[PDB]
Design a protein around this nucleic acid. Structure first.
Ligand SMILES: [Mg+2]
Ligand SMILES: [Mg+2]
Ligand SMILES: [Mg+2]
Ligand SMILES: [Mg+2]
Ligand SMILES: [Mg+2]
Ligand SMILES: [Mg+2]
Ligand SMILES: [Mg+2]
Ligand SMILES: [Mg+2]
Ligand SMILES: [Mg+2]
Ligand SMILES: [Mg+2]
Ligand SMILES: [Mg+2]
Ligand SMILES: [Mg+2]
Lengths: 107, 354, 61, 50, 153, 60, 63
RNA sequence: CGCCGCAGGUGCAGAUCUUGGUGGUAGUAGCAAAUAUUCAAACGAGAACUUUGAAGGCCGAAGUGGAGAAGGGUUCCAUGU
């Protein structure tokens, strides 16, 4: 339907390659927001604060190469707003990134 | 959806009790008001019996809160209303043949029953009171009788304004400027639905239009003056204050927090009088009022030689017909006037009963 | 209640000073009322009392 | 500075009281032809001679 | 008031104006020239697009130094820009003009911007500081705007 | 707390307050405001009460 | 809405810098009402304002 | 204002002329010294800049810290726009 949530792994290393030192981690988080806007169908990506900490975990110029997140497109049926659907992306701690697929997480 | 309406049998009875408690208090005072008495003494005894009777009623239920809804407000021959002095102030000794206006409110579980009457003291047997004073209070009573007939869902507030103006012109008198009667409900005295008397440009452009609604409390007042209808202040201390539970300021004075704590405990939202304390009450009031934590009720004086009149009652609106539970002892046989009514529509509303 | 220099000129200096004193204490409470808000009536009587003090002081001088 | 003479502080006192906007009711006076305090001063723009 | 180019019939026309608006006059003159003649719904949608940088306005007269864009081909031209401030002020004044049309009782579905003009307003003076102790102007260039919408289909 | 003339010292302030208000004062703390007028803090004797006096003054 | 005053007051009564004062991000309305001390102290005493601990600068590596 | 006389501080394109206003340049030069911001929320019509919290940083005690002297003079503090 429209409330579904899935788990992705974003190659930040590939999306961030070539960016200067003082603009890497800032670029990494608008690349997550761009990634979420594309995989889901909605603008207004809300980025969890725990996700913010993970990207900035190693400073401003050493961003993790990959990060596992969970996008959750949820209804905005809480207040009068232009968009009725919003995607909230959380941080998923993982030990390895090997053989990790895009999987549909249940309720 | 949790507001209490007059639909309940138990609520109606105590509302009939409120009319009896208002009438019985007014009856006690009118006999006990005489020439050469202390205006302060009538207020303390005016409060004194109203403490005990509200304490001895309903012995089987001692949980809910009851008491005063509006303090004993008195004004004689020169003041409109909102006048209740402290002990330090000079007393006003009631002289012979004065007309005095008395206001009082009683609250039971936040339901408000408010009455107020104006009468001339020490009228002998067989005498005929005549003059311009013989006109104002008789005009006010016809405003009351007219109001009782016209209080019904469907008759608009502005029709009440013109009706009181037209009778005032018929009696060569004018109401005092810009007063407000209110539509009452549980735990409130400053209801949004209000009816306005003797308005002007600023009043008519900022007042609301509304239709009377059933199952409501209506604290109807009539304020009519014999002269010009303009009032101001002559530098007398404002005594009556009411708290507003909407806004909030953090008091910085120990007395103000203590004064604000005691006000909340005893007179939470209904207008109180500084007689209920006095050394710490006066100095706590300036800080709270400065930050508008209390809305004052200043004294309003008319001109020298001008006379004012007043009648107020609380009435409950049922679908089948209104009933005024509180009334004052007025009689037309011992009180006449030199000008009479001239308008046909005014005739119809006075001959018709209910 | 207004005083005039013409009627002040008959009194002795003993109650002329007495009249100046209670005229001064009246102006003291008048300035008090001015600070504490007061009323428009009380403010307007400040000038009428100030000129009365000048009137009494002029006569004794 | 914090260390001032009496006559300097009295000088600074007057300059403070006269750096105030004109009363609003002045505009209503007949034949007013005044609109604002044109002699207003700001501590940062123009400095007192003293 | 006296508008220039009064409408043919002030009964199926609505007007709106504003004076001393703190917008650049050169950016607004180009925006009004593109808006002129547009239908009311097409003009409103177009100005939101310019804010979103999905459609541009072509800078035809005041184009010195203005860069080129791909979107400036829809209008036969080469250089165009996306003046956000000009679009918001014209959108606000279009919303005011629409409410006027519904005030005098004509349908807003069939409104077309027949006339729209932007005038220079009195400039406002500020100060900039130059190299060798020199003071130079920092004037603003506000604009008066006015338009007439005609009901037609 | 009163506003007094700048030409009056603490002794005359104490004498004036004591005589024209019929109270006994303990000490006077004086300062000149930035407006240019003196401000006197008059501490009353422990057997007097400021709130009592401020009532009779009328500044309550 | 704007807690610049409360942060200044809370740091003063806590005898700490503005780094170490923690205002509750959820109960912003309550702290915003506290326009004075003895109101900040009340909020401190019931846990709506906390003095944050000193960030650890260990000497174990030096030792 | 015409006509008869009278009297001039009596005719402008220039003087790197005086004063005032306005253009092209031109939506141009430019808003590049001292490493750096990001996430969520609140108020709010409106948030890259306000406030709160979380994170990443900088000053690094010869400080981007805490106080004064000259100098300033109300810039201090609350509330509101
Ligand atoms: Mg300077
Ligand atoms: Mg060029
Ligand atoms: Mg410069
Ligand atoms: Mg220079
Ligand atoms: Mg000293
Ligand atoms: Mg010449
Ligand atoms: Mg010339
Ligand atoms: Mg020339
Ligand atoms: Mg450029
Ligand atoms: Mg640059
Ligand atoms: Mg460092
Ligand atoms: Mg400040």
């Amino acid at each position: 339907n429209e409330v579904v949530t899935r788990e992705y792994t974003i190659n930040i290393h590939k999306r961030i390659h070539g960016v200067g030192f003082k603009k890497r981690a800032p670029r990494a988080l608008k690349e997550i927001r761009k990634f979420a806007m594309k995989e889901m169908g909605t603008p207004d990506v809300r980025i969890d604060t725990r996700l913010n900490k993970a990207v900035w975990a190693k400073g401003i110029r050493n961003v993790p190469y990959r990060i596992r997140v969970r996008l959750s497109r949820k209804r905005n049926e809480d207040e009068d707003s232009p968009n009725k659907l919003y995607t909230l992306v959380t941080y998923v701690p993982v030990t390895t990134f090997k053989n990790l697929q895009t999987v549909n997480v249940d309720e | 959806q949790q507001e209490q309406t007059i639909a309940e049998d138990l609520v109606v009875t105590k509302y009939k009790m409120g009319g009896d408690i208002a009438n019985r208090v007014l009856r006690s005072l009118v006999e006990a008001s005489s020439s050469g008495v202390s205006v302060l003494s009538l207020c303390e005894k005016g409060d004194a019996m109203i403490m005990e009777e509200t304490g001895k009623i309903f012995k089987k239920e001692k949980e809910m809160k009851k008491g005063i809804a509006f303090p004993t407000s008195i004004s004689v021959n020169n003041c409109v209303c909102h006048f209740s002095p402290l002990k330090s102030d000079q007393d006003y000794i009631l002289k012979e043949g004065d007309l005095v206006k008395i206001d009082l409110g009683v609250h039971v579980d936040g339901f408000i029953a408010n009455v107020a009457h104006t009468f001339v003291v020490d009228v002998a047997q067989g005498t005929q009171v005549t003059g311009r004073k013989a006109d104002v209070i008789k005009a006010a009573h016809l405003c009351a009788e007219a109001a009782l007939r016209l209080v019904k869902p469907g008759n608009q507030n502005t029709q009440v304004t013109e009706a009181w103006n037209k009778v005032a012109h018929s009696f060569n008198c004018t109401p005092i400027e810009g007063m407000l009667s209110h539509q009452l409900k549980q735990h409130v005295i400053d209801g949004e639905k209000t009816i306005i008397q003797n308005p002007t440009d600023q009043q008519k452009k900022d007042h609301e239009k509304a239709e009377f609604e059933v199952h409501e409390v209506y604290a109807v007042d009539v304020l009519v003056s014999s002269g010009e209808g303009k009032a101001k202040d002559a530098g007398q201390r404002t005594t009556i204050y009411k708290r507003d539970p909407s806004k909030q300021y953090g008091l910085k004075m120990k007395t103000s927090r203590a004064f604000f704590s005691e006000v909340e405990r005893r007179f939470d939202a209904m207008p109180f009088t500084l007689r209920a304390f006095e050394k710490k009450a006066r100095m706590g009031v300036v800080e709270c009022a400065k930050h508008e934590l209390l809305q004052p009720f200043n004294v309003l004086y008319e001109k020298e030689g001008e006379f004012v009149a007043q009648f107020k009652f609380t009435v409950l609106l049922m679908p089948n017909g209104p009933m005024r539970i509180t009334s004052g002892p007025f009689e037309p046989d011992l009180y006449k006037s030199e000008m009479e009514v001239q308008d046909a529509e005014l005739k119809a509303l006075l001959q018709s009963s209910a | 209640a207004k005083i005039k220099a013409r009627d002040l000129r008959g009194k002795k200096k003993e109650e002329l000073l007495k009249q100046l004193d209670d005229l001064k204490v009246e102006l003291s409470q008048l300035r008090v009322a001015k600070v504490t808000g007061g009323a428009a009536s009380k403010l307007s009587k400040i000038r009428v009392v100030r000129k009365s003090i000048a009137r009494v002081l002029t006569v004794i001088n | 500075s914090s260390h001032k003479t009496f006559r300097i502080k009295r000088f600074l006192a007057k300059k403070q009281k006269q750096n105030r906007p004109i009363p609003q009711w002045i505009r209503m006076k007949t034949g007013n032809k005044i609109r604002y305090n044109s002699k207003r001063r700001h501590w940062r723009r123009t400095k007192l001679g003293l | 008031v006296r508008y220039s180019l009064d409408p043919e019939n002030p009964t199926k026309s609505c007007k709106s104006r504003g004076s001393n608006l703190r917008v650049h006059f050169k950016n607004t003159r180009e925006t009004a020239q593109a808006i002129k003649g547009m239908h009311i719904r097409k003009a409103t949608k177009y100005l939101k697009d310019v804010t979103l940088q999905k459609q541009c306005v072509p800078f035809r007269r005041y184009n010195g130094g203005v860069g080129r864009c791909a979107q400036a081909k829809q209008w036969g031209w080469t250089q165009g820009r996306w003046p956000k401030k000009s679009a918001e002020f014209l959108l606000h004044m279009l919303k005011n003009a629409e409410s006027n049309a519904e005030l005098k009782g004509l349908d807003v579905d069939s409104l077309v911007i027949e006339h729209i003009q932007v005038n220079k307003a009195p400039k406002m003076r500020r100060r900039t500081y130059r190299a060798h102790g020199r003071i130079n102007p920092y004037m603003s260039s506000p604009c008066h705007i006015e338009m007439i919408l005609t009901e037609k289909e | 707390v009163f506003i007094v003339d700048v030409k009056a010292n603490k002794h005359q302030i104490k004498q004036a307050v004591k005589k024209l208000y019929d109270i006994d004062v303990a000490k006077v703390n004086t300062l000149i405001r930035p407006d240019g007028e003196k401000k006197a803090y008059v501490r009353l004797a422990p057997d007097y009460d400021a709130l009592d006096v401020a009532n009779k003054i009328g500044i309550i | 809405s704007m807690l610049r005053l409360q942060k200044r007051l809370a740091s003063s009564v806590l005898r700490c810098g503005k780094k170490k004062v923690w205002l509750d991000p959820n109960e912003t309305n309550e702290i915003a009402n506290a326009n004075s001390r003895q109101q900040i102290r009340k909020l401190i005493k019931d846990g709506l304002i906390i003095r944050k601990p000193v960030t650890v600068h260990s000497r174990a590596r030096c030792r």
